[PDB]
């Protein structure tokens, strides 16, 4: 029933975001009580966004997830730009942001209280990415069993912070909360960037395909499994940040590099034995969440002519998305080697939240013009015109703030508008682009030994 569905979704939202974001949020918030309300606001906004996506997927029924939810609500033109922006900004940056924390928390046990050189972290991060992608490409079964074990280690990675963070609340260790809504200045110019960290933690409901054919009793358990399972996650994250705040004061939280390691070394005696190994196993589970998540997007897009026919084929045997990873790999290396986590996250979340606030805004259009078409689930028109008008106001304001990491993101998104000459053009110059397209197609599917799915 909805019981298993709640577990299914809650296994996606939880992840490394609760270890990467806290310091980021506090950075450009300037307070503790004003930071703990950002987490609640982003929790309720993630609730609204997921609840809107559930309606988008339940009124369209053309399977394919986020891409199809934009293909026909607006037209192919925003859909190609959606695929372009995702595969050039979102997935590389998201993977490099999860793994830049995995690399830190895997080196933390060895550098107990030392300054880890910035290049060792990147080298270990790249090694981890390569291991994950070889694992996803060599075999599938062992990419699912490991994912299950890593989901369990992801749940443990937060139950190992909540429990020692409430065992001191029952003691009465509330001292950092006295002047909660007071601290530094941190004007509105740095509020959107903190919003970016806040909503990044509640990540996973994007690539969460829903089916009305399999889910038991639709119109019942699709919203009744997101409402009562994003509230749980919001509560979990709020208590986790409270656990962080009871021990670590705001100032030394700010100057720290990893938060879980400081919390562990300040509470537990076996701190390095458990915490910067379960956080690492949870980040490894998160980056493992690139398992076919992107390849399904290739398969959906390439059908109606947006991605090359190469990028949606599978191995002859050991059936895996081999061509879908050798395109996400070099981009991930470029991002993690020429960027910073505080500047990769802005790059990520500008392009994500712009094309999500332009997506859920489609609901406010689909409900008005061309209405009354197989609408099992029906959200009231208060959630879309409160999520769209928050994405497109914490993003549009994120260009008055930090324009050298979100400005490039906007430039790349705008580059999609010309990039619609690959899709349509008077002539492709047979010798000068078609011949190379065919030759690269031959070489790429002959080297990787990959074949079309079933066509």
């Amino acid at each position: 029933t909805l019981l298993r569905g709640v577990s299914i979704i809650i296994g996606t939202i939880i992840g490394a975001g609760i270890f990467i974001s806290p310091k980021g949020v506090l950075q450009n918030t300037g307070s503790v009580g004003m930071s703990l309300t950002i987490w609640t606001v982003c929790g309720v906004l993630s609730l609204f966004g997921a609840l809107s996506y559930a309606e988008l997927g339940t009124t369209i029924k053309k399977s394919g997830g986020h891409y199809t939810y934009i293909l026909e609500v607006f037209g192919p033109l925003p859909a190609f730009v959606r695929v372009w922006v995702e595969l050039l900004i979102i997935r590389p940056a998201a993977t490099a942001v999860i793994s830049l924390a995995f690399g830190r928390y895997i080196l933390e046990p060895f550098f107990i209280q030392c300054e880890i050189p910035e290049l060792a972290i990147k080298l270990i991060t790249a090694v981890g990415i390569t291991v994950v992608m070889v694992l996803n490409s060599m075999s599938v079964s062992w990419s699912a069993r490991i994912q299950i074990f890593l989901t369990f280690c992801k749940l443990t990675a937060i139950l190992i912070i909540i429990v020692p963070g409430v065992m001191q609340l029952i003691k009465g260790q509330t001292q950092n909360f006295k002047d909660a809504f007071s601290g530094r200045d941190s004007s509105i110019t740095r509020l959107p960037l903190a919003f970016y960290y806040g909503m990044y933690a509640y990540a996973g409901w994007f690539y969460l395909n829903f089916v009305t054919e399999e889910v038991e009793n639709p119109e019942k358990t699709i919203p009744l499994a997101i409402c009562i399972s994003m509230a749980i996650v919001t509560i979990g994250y709020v208590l986790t940040n409270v656990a962080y705040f009871t021990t670590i004061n705001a100032e030394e939280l700010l100057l720290s590099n990893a938060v879980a390691v400081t919390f562990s070394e300040r509470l537990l005696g076996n701190f390095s034995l458990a915490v910067p190994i379960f956080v690492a196993l949870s980040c490894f589970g998160s980056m493992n969440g690139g398992v076919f998540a992107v390849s399904r997007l290739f398969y959906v897009a390439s059908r109606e002519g947006h991605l090359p026919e190469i990028l949606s084929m599978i191995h002859v045997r050991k059936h895996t998305p081999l061509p879908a990873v050798i395109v996400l790999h070099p981009l991930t290396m470029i991002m993690l080697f020429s960027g910073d986590l505080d500047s990769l996250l802005n790059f990520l979340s500008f392009a994500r939240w712009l094309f999500i606030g332009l997506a859920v805004a489609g609901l406010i259009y689909l409900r008005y013009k061309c209405p009354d078409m197989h609408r099992p689930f029906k959200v009231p028109l208060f959630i879309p015109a409160l999520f769209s008008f928050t994405c497109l106001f914490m993003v549009a304001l994120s260009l008055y703030s930090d324009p050298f990491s979100t400005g490039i993101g906007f430039v790349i998104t705008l580059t999609g508008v010309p990039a619609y000459y690959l899709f349509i053009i008077w002539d492709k110059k047979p010798r000068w682009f078609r011949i190379m397209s065919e030759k690269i197609t031959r070489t790429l599917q002959i080297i990787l030994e990959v074949v079309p799915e079933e066509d």
Binding site: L107, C114, I116, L123, V316, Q445, I446, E449
Partner: protein, 464 residues
């Protein structure tokens, strides 16, 4: 699908193997480079297991009726201003002696009998319980005849090895994190009595110290009283001399830091008396910067963060003056508690003496260098005293102290600091005693020129 099968054959399969061969060489190269960078990177030293009193200043509280207020003095009231004490970021409260002590009598003075006038153990248990949550550990003085001509009994209190021993067990059962005795010159051959009590206290638990005290300024007496035990934080009158001469405040500090070299010490102008009993006014700001930066633990009485002056405000008893909490905290003949002197009249001013103490204590109790950084002092101008507090990879420091009348130049001829801690040309200023210099502007150490009676404090993290 089958056309791909036939195409995986001699001639183009040779390429396929070489591609993942180069890929694996590159991946092992990344891994080996990573482990080499792990090896090449400097491994830091180990943190030397700092106790609680190794982290922040202590805070003596002699007279409760003067720290609380006339008539209002009791052990319960300490809960009211325990948040004030935690505001100073102190880590201890030398509180007492609050035991039953009628007068001058050995059989009518029991350490295990709490004095009713301050309130009985009902308030004392709450004292400990509410002190623990703010991490403000309590220390109790056991000077038995603390109401007589001599702090220790006259004929012979031999029962100290019995009575004080039962105290060092019973009260350590209650949960007091350390003790203290005073005027250990009267304690006949204290070096063995202190040996017994320190043996008891540390053997009971290492998170339990024992302070002493004496009115001696000769280092030979201090060394002979540090005869065998060296975990005892003897606070003496070593600095009790007004000094301030270019060599006394230099030579005494160096020589004492040369007897045991690095062994952890206690820095205080006296055992019980205030700073202002010895220091002229213009040096009150100066010495507080010195005592917070020297290696060891600083010891402050009550009202040494605001400088209780018996000269500005009359009527104050010379041994125990009255703390000023508000605009009427003096209950005797009033008219001299003007907002300059009080606590609230200094909690708001950013340049107030209390604010200086708060900044210094925040820096001392937080940053890893001042907690346990090594100490090097180098030559400078005649009226100066400069030094540095450096740890393995954490922030550096630098302090300059002008003890003279005429503004002098830094005259930094260091020329001997270890290359790990050699001074740069511009150092990030952090604070100053007499304000006016922009706090944050990197000052130059060649043009570093002082004002009379001014301190400084700078920073320079060159892979420090």
């Amino acid at each position: 699908e089958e056309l791909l099968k036939v195409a995986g054959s001699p001639g183009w399969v040779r390429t396929r193997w070489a591609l993942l061969l180069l890929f694996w060489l590159g991946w092992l190269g990344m891994l080996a480079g990573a482990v080499v960078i792990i090896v090449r990177a400097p491994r830091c030293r180990e943190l030397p297991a700092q106790k609680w009193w190794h982290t922040g200043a202590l805070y003596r509280i002699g007279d409760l009726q003067a720290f609380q207020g006339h008539g209002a003095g009791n052990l319960a009231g300490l809960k009211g201003r325990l948040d004030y004490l935690s505001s100073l970021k102190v880590k201890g409260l030398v509180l007492g002696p609050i035991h039953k002590n009628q007068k001058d009598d050995v059989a009518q003075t029991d350490l295990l009998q709490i004095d009713p006038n301050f309130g009985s153990k009902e308030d004392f248990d709450s004292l400990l319980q509410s002190a623990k949550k703010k991490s403000i550990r309590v220390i109790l003085d056991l000077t038995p005849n603390y109401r007589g001509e001599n702090s220790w009994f006259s004929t012979q209190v031999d029962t100290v090895a019995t009575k004080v021993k039962d105290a060092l067990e019973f009260w350590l059962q209650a949960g007091v994190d350390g003790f203290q005795v005073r005027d250990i010159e009267n304690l006949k051959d204290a070096s063995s009595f202190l040996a017994e009590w320190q043996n008891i206290t540390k053997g009971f638990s290492e998170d339990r110290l024992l302070i002493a005290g004496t009115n001696s300024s000769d280092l030979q007496q201090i060394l002979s009283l540090l005869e065998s035990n060296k975990d005892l934080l003897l606070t003496s009158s070593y600095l009790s001399d007004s000094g301030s001469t270019g060599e006394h405040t230099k030579s005494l500090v160096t020589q004492y830091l040369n007897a045991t070299g690095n062994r952890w010490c206690s820095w205080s102008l006296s055992q019980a008396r205030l700073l202002t009993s010895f220091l002229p006014a213009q040096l009150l700001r100066l010495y507080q910067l010195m005592l917070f930066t020297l290696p060891g633990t600083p010891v402050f009485s009550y009202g040494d963060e605001i400088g209780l002056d018996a000269a500005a405000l009359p009527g104050q008893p010379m041994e125990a003056p009255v703390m000023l909490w508000d605009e009427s905290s003096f209950p005797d003949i009033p008219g001299a508690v003007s907002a300059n002197m009080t606590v609230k009249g200094q909690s708001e001013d950013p340049g107030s003496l209390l604010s200086l103490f708060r900044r210094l204590s925040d820096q001392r109790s937080k940053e890893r260098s001042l907690l346990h950084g090594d100490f090097h002092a180098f030559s400078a101008g005649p009226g100066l005293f400069s030094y540095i507090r450096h740890w393995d990879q954490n922030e550096r420091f630098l302090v300059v102290l002008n003890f003279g009348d005429v503004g002098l130049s830094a005259g930094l001829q260091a020329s001997d600091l270890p290359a790990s801690a050699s001074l740069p040309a511009k150092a990030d200023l952090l604070l100053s005693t007499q304000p006016g210099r922009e706090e944050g502007s990197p000052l130059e150490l060649e043009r570093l020129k002082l004002e009379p009676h001014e301190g400084l404090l700078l920073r320079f993290p060159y892979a420090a």
